[PDB]
Motif scaffolding. Sequence first.
Motif, short mmCIF file in Angstrom:
data_model
loop_
_atom_site.label_atom_id
_atom_site.label_comp_id
_atom_site.label_asym_id
_atom_site.label_seq_id
_atom_site.Cartn_x
_atom_site.Cartn_y
_atom_site.Cartn_z
N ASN A 221 0.79 -1.24 0.00
CA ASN A 221 0.00 0.00 0.00
C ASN A 221 0.82 1.28 0.00
OD1 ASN A 221 -2.43 -1.31 0.04
ND2 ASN A 221 -1.95 -1.91 2.13
N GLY A 222 1.95 1.29 0.71
CA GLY A 222 2.81 2.47 0.76
C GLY A 222 3.83 2.51 -0.35
N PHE A 223 3.99 3.66 -0.92
CA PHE A 223 4.91 3.87 -2.00
C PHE A 223 5.96 4.96 -1.74
CE2 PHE A 223 6.13 6.28 -5.95
CZ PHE A 223 6.55 5.17 -6.68
N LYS B 164 -1.36 4.52 -1.15
CA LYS B 164 -2.05 4.46 -2.42
C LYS B 164 -3.54 4.44 -2.21
CE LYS B 164 -2.44 -0.40 -3.27
NZ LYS B 164 -1.95 -1.51 -4.08
N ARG B 165 -3.99 3.89 -1.07
CA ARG B 165 -5.44 3.84 -0.74
C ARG B 165 -6.00 5.21 -0.45
NH1 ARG B 165 -4.94 -0.61 3.78
NH2 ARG B 165 -3.35 1.01 4.35
N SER B 166 -5.16 6.17 -0.03
CA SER B 166 -5.63 7.52 0.30
C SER B 166 -5.25 8.59 -0.67
CB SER B 166 -5.05 8.02 1.63
OG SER B 166 -5.33 7.04 2.60
#
Length: 185
Positions: free
Chosen positions: A89-91, A98-100
């Motif tokens: 999820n974190g990039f 990425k979800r937010s």
Amino acid sequence: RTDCYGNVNRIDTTGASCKTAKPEGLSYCGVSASKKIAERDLQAMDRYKTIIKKVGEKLCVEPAVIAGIISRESHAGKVLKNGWGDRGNGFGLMQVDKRSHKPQGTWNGEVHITQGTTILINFIKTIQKKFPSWTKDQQLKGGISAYNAGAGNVRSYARMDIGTTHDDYANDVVARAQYYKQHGY
């Protein structure tokens, strides 16, 4: 220049919780553990120093704060896979979720650090509005804590980090940041 949102050196910190330190292989916790972890990441951090400092100067935030978040979030890229965190999820160095937020740029570039830093500043601003009787530095602290758990999680100065990952988010980051500041960031 870099002081619009406060001075990390003026913030009080209890550093890393044991929940954070142990797993990193240390037998002790707190401020010195934070700094030791920060030091283990310095060489990797140094690869991005110029960019970290350029972004901090652009946005009027301390580069050492950006470095502290970087260390905490991705160990300066060491624990990432093509820029992604372990859950996918974190990039990026700063781990934008990425979800937010849709992630912008390459994982280790100026676009990315800009985006992450902007998100941080937005949290800082929200906290400044939410607790206008706090000092600027206290607000900076709260903004960093919110970076991890959201603004809603910041209900007081003293217990802001409860509910963040390891219950020590901002305290840890701030301690790491103080180490960085000492190292030219």
